[PDB]
């Protein structure tokens, strides 16, 4: 009955495709065609953060929009002060192969992980003046590619073992496991309402998950290569993907299909990081061609370019008030742009 | 700047000094990426050279070495192989006694892996130290099992020397653009303690080339 089950799966896939095709009467291009586009984005390097002596692989802004944590492959986790450009903390890591870092919304913790398949939680605010690891979350059989704090006690991590997990930092055991991806999961994005998250994988598919129940809700398949970055629209009913075929795409949770494509002919390098402006008007993407691009989400125009990095732009984040954009890069430098 | 601001700046300066010291200390260490098949033999290489990835530390002639075993990463290597792009050398281990073994052929699988690693875009100029392990099993099996099982176009004497030379030549033939990177091939057995000196010599040559390029003179 294996052939019968495969035929049933194909029929269900075709049914889903035609059901989501029926509700695609218009396109995002036509609706936003008559609106005024972004004139010209021209940001400048307000600050340059120096002190990392290897490639930057991840950065995350703090909730206060002044502190930010940086992960670099020199084994250092640096918390910066983007205003005065001075280092608040410098955390040495047990394993220097770190691919992700996160900042707790409360600011009391940071997380990091990588080729060790472990998420480490560091207590920033102790009675002593040092930063110490509080718990190590083991249980992933592949490298950790992303991690995002739910609160002070819950964190969700993606891994290269085709699995996302939800952890309880109090006990150190993954309460929930989110299976279904056939490729390595590369990115995570928690919703503003925090009740669900999306995850892009190497199987060129993005999946929306329910944090409470622990099952996949929707699956989005429009890309041609591995999805490297995923980000949530500030509304919470959309998300953007950055893949290896030099194409960004926008998906709508309610419409359950791709909305609009962000690509150009002269860009043949994959996207390493994506992020959104505060209002969702500007989609910012870091690329392999040493510079970060600024796209207008509603019209898919290249509003601006954040050139200024001498190597691949690996990480990219916007503040919670939308005041600044920070870009890390493989040339070991972080840059704040306004 | 207030008093607290000045003290924060002073703390940041101390952090910067510590980071500079750490970077200076880390620049003095030689990093090696250990690759090869599971049964090719790397545990013996690791032993003779003394989940996640495994880091091995050893010192030889005032030179500090870091060896990274990535054989436990059961993921898609194209996503994390650039983490080792800046590396002194690659130690590739191949068991030349499994030419007649069946996992397709094990020797051909090792050849495919060597071809993929050598011609990777992240290791264009990274010298490869190739270890052909399990010498005496190969010698003992070359008398009965001929090399024709693995290579159908060998047409050579069924002796250890000719077969081993043919295998080494076939492996170094995969080195496309052999003008920037050099492959150091060594024949090692289980009971043979000379590989540390070979790795040190290859690393010293790589370091000479590296600081020749540093001096703007190459």
């Amino acid at each position, epitope marked *: 009955e294996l052939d019968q089950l495969r035929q049933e799966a194909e029929q269900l896939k075709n049914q889903i495709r035609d059901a989501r095709k029926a509700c695609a009467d218009a396109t995002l291009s036509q609706i936003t065609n008559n609106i005024d586009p972004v004139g010209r984005i021209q940001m400048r390097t307000r600050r340059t953060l120096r002190g990392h002596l290897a490639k930057i692989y991840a950065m995350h802004w703090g909730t206060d929009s*002044r*502190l930010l944590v940086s992960a670099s492959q020199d084994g250092k986790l640096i918390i910066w*002060d983007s205003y*005065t450009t001075n280092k*608040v*903390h410098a955390i040495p890591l047990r394993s220097s192969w770190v691919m992700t870092c996160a900042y707790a919304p409360s*600011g009391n913790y940071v997380a990091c992980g990588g080729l060790d398949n472990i998420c480490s939680i560091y207590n920033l*605010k102790t*009675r*002593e*003046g*040092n930063v110490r690891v509080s718990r190590e979350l083991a249980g992933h059989t592949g490298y950790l590619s992303c991690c995002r704090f739910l609160d002070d006690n819950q964190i969700v991590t993606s891994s290269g073992d085709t699995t996302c997990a939800l952890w309880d930092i109090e006990t150190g055991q993954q309460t929930t496991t989110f299976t279904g991806h056939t490729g390595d999961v590369m990115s995570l994005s928690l919703a503003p309402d925090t009740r669900l998250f999306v995850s892009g994988a190497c199987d060129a598919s993005a999946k929306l998950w329910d944090v409470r129940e622990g099952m996949c809700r929707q699956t989005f398949t429009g890309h041609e290569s591995d999805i490297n970055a995923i980000c949530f629209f500030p509304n919470g009913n959309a998300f953007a993907t950055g893949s290896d075929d030099a194409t960004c795409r926008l998906f709508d949770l309610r419409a359950d299909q791709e909305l609009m494509t962000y690509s150009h002919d002269n860009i043949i390098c994959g996207i390493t990081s994506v992020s959104f402006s505060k209002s969702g008007r500007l989609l910012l993407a870091g690329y392999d061609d040493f510079n970060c691009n600024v796209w207008d989400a509603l019209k898919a125009d290249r509003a601006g370019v954040l050139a200024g990095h001498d190597n691949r732009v690996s990480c990219l984040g916007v503040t919670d008030d939308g005041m600044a954009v920070a870009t890390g890069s493989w040339d070991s430098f972080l840059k704040i742009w306004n | 700047l*207030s*008093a*607290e*601001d*000045k*003290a*924060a700046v*002073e*703390r940041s300066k*101390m952090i910067d000094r510590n980071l500079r010291e750490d970077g200076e200390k880390a620049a003095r260490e030689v990093k090696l990426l250990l690759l090869g098949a599971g049964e090719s033999g790397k545990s013996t290489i690791v032993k003779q050279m003394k989940t996640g990835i495994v880091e091995t530390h050893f010192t030889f002639k005032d030179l500090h070495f870091k060896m990274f075993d990535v054989g436990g990463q059961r993921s898609e290597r194209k996503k994390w192989i650039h983490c080792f792009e800046g590396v002194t050398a690659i130690i590739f281990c191949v068991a030349l006694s499994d030419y007649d073994l069946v996992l397709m052929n094990r020797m051909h699988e090792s050849m495919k892996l060597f071809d993929s690693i050598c011609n990777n875009k992240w290791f264009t100029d990274t010298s490869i130290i190739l270890f052909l392990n399990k010498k005496d099993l190969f010698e003992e099996k070359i008398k009965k099992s001929p090399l024709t099982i693995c290579y159908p176009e060998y047409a050579g004497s069924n002796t250890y020397e000719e077969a081993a030379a043919y295998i080494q030549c076939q492996f170094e033939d995969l080195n496309k653009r052999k003008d920037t990177k050099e492959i150091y091939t060594h024949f090692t057995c289980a009971t043979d303690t000379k590989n540390v000196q070979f790795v040190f010599d290859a690393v010293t040559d790589v370091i000479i080339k590296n600081n020749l390029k540093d001096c703007g003179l190459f």
Partner: single-chain antibody
Amino acid sequence: VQLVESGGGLVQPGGSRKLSCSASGFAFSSFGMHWVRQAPEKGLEWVAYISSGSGTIYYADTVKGRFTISRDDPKNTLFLQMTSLRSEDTAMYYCVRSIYYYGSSPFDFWGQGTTLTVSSSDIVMTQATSSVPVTPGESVSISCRSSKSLLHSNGNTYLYWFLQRPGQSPQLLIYRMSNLASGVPDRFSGSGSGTAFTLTISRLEAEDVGVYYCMQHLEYPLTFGAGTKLEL
């Protein structure tokens, strides 16, 4: 976290003595440490400061050129060398740790305190109220004044509040006005603007009875304010 001070005792005038403080339970090397003295009947008074790494040292004008402060990070000890002691140098000396980064809380932990007795442009902080009679369970307010505006261009008002229970070392309540210190109940509140500041307690128990001090950290020599005693 504990700080224990050693030394003190009877000293003839014109003599010398060395004060030592032993630090345990925290990263002593990453903290800047202060010396603050309190006269037998008067309030607290700042003495000297040595930064992290000993790269910055400050002294009170009363002791400048006469006292010397040094630290031994591997030994986790803070030293105060004082020579030619005057009759006005008799006081109980406190050791205070204070770490400075963004969002930090300086002066958070104070030592037990050692006492020494000798036989026979600075910002001014004012606390007019004193010996306030207080009924438990009520709401009280303590006022403060400054000769200069403590509000810097950073937007930070460097006004610190401390509680000194009878027979106990002073403890931090609010570091930069309207910033409740860790381990302090939510009843205490800080408010103020410019040169006038207020400390408010919504409801109180017999625990928070004692002398309340106000300190400025805008510029050295880190002047204190006169005590505001609360009596049950």
